[PDB]
Subunit: 234 residues, 4 copies
């Protein structure tokens, strides 16, 4: 029996990873701001996959929300085995057009939210030799016009993840670097065709699930994957 915590679990990649891990029998602890969505997913997975699911409001932009979430998760399940720090968002504007508010929100979720998530479960993961997966972006290590605020936070997250790894060699840290994915990311909605340059979240979640089946001594550090319909840029 293993326990996976997933942030940003209410839709898109996080929801997909929850579903895939449920298929392998993980107990799940789900967090996001959209509690209605979390409840709906949880009931479905409990019944259809026969897993235990816990869910709780989580706003990773707020220190106290992360703290309370983790306290409740740890109370529910004991120690965790997998933490998926996946919540993120993107605003895309030339850097002189990007607002203070937009840049701050991206920093609070994509960077500090990850940091808060990982630190909250860190002692637990150290005990379990667990796996923290952080969904950054393929743009954690390249640049795009209009991406300056988003990209800067994803480079920062990459550095954060690797630094957590250096500081905690008893835990396994996995940077997941998808290209464009057909989600609500970037003010959009699912339903966008693969051909317009998008992965589907269920493909990503399947990449994840199947790597998480590796033995506990394997540390998958980095996975970058994009649609064949996305131009291969570096």
């Amino acid at each position: 029996m293993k326990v996976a915590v997933i942030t940003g679990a209410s839709r898109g990649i996080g929801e997909a990873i929850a579903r895939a891990l449920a298929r392998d029998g993980y107990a799940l602890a789900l967090g996001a701001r959209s509690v209605d969505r979390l409840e709906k997913i949880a009931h479905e997975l409990m019944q259809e996959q026969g897993v235990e699911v816990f869910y709780h409001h989580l706003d990773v932009s707020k220190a106290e929300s992360v703290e309370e979430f983790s306290k409740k998760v740890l109370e529910r399940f004991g120690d965790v085995d997998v933490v998926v720090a996946n919540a993120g968002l993107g605003y895309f504007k030339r850097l002189e057009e990007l607002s203070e508010e937009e840049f701050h929100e991206m920093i609070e979720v994509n960077l500090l939210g990850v940091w808060r998530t990982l630190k909250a479960f860190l002692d637990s993961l150290k005990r379990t030799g667990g796996l923290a997966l952080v969904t950054t972006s393929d743009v954690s290590a390249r640049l795009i016009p209009y991406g300056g605020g988003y990209v800067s936070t994803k480079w920062a997250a990459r550095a954060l993840v690797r630094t957590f790894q250096i500081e905690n060699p008893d835990v396994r840290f996995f940077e997941l670097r998808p290209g464009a994915v057909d989600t609500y990311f970037g003010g959009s909605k699912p339903g966008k065709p693969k051909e317009k340059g998008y992965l589907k979240p269920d493909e990503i979640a399947e990449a994840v699930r199947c790597l998480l089946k590796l033995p506990k001594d394997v540390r998958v550090e980095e996975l970058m994957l994009r649609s064949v319909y996305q131009r291969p840029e570096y």
Copy 2:
């Protein structure tokens, strides 16, 4: 229904990938200099996994060998779906002690070998929208003392793979970057325990197999994985 070519298939990571892909029913075309080893692996997989296996001598340091190998593979199977450019070797010495011969051999296998392999199958992979996996190393993007020769060829290989990808957006190129693996690499023999800082080839091959089950529109570009017992260095 699908055909995987594997270089350095006589042992270690390449053999393991051959075994894993045979479990998924791939037809195999195996190349290495140790034909005795290839024949032994081939008969086993044909009988035990029910797959078609072709094998042929291949020395990736020799242009003419790679060309002949590829011609014979293509004749046997028609177009290929997967090409695993895995052959490689390492000599570890301070840069002033490394010999001309040692450096040239590493260049010829780790860089020019990969190049010859991918170019020989490039038109085929373009037709099939196939996948070229290259086993570089985690040191394709970091440095180690005593590794200057080895590392420099792996950095070169990374640039090569990425350039192939930019030049051929109709093909999927996957850079596989393992840390230390328990094989014959670096003048050693299998049997070294995980705890000394080694992944096992069958772990690398299962990560590969399961990522190769993703739909054809998914382009896995990079995977870096290491033993938990290997210090996390970047």
Copy 3:
């Protein structure tokens, strides 16, 4: 005939750059929170180097301060030729011990400060084909234990500077990446000997000055320099 704006000009690297550029006859616009320090530096350089110097309070953590500073600079001099976005700070703790306040302050100065600085002067620099120098760090592209907060903001700054450059090909962006420098950085005071692994600010400022003498068509993008007494880590 040319005008250089320098943030964090009250001490350390920024003061040194101001002094070096004054030797070359640049008019200077100095910003920092320590106005006492700026006034003292300004009077000296006006008399001893014969240059025009303007100074004004600047807190790069505050949008309104940067906007006011830039408005006053532009009013005083017209368009600027050089903008040195140098203000920065570091708190060094394991990622789980770093405080919310420490992380936010680093974000606000090292990342958002730089952003505000460059955007405030961007239209000016576009007119003059000018040069924006940002003092990041050698750790804008490597990791250190205890530096996760600091490093993550410097990785973010690197991505920011490069994105500014892609978005504004009519401006020259120069990422200056020093190693350890003997300043007040990291809660210290100047006077630490070179042998303990420190460059002196006047060495960094002379590297800058002399690269700033290159013709206007030359775009110096990156300079990384460290003391011989600092271990060469990547």
Copy 4:
């Protein structure tokens, strides 16, 4: 009195660096295949700059040529202070079009030539706390279509230089990363206008000279500079 060895000194960047260093009074040891050119430069610099100049045939693709060159240089001057490993060449073709010969030549000059150059003077530089400058390319850390052979060797050279640095912390290694420069590089001839995307070698050599005036305790590790007329790509 200081001694600078320069490979690829017969034209372009290497010649320019010789000229600039002569202006600062360095004794010079020049190597390239074009001995007539070297003699012409040497006579000019001896008379006009009053420096000592030694020159000797050097083909960095040949181990024995490098060895003999270094022996003769060390015999002439004693220990050296600066070694500029600058010889290089580029062929630009899609990777499946690039010939064995072209790729080998690039490897022999851009990679192994550098290695041979640096190892030959390594003991000398260790005694003098000297500076080895290697002219790689801005493409030592990015990719270009048609550049696969060239770029791969420049990534390899970057790794080599940094590895020499890790292995020899008593020597200073400087990676010089120009963009396009108006030389004979790439089968061209000087005279190309700056506006078509080119630096002039004398600008590069001036960047170099002036950084080489820094104290001996300063280790300039990396300098990347391009023309404002070259698109800023990463």
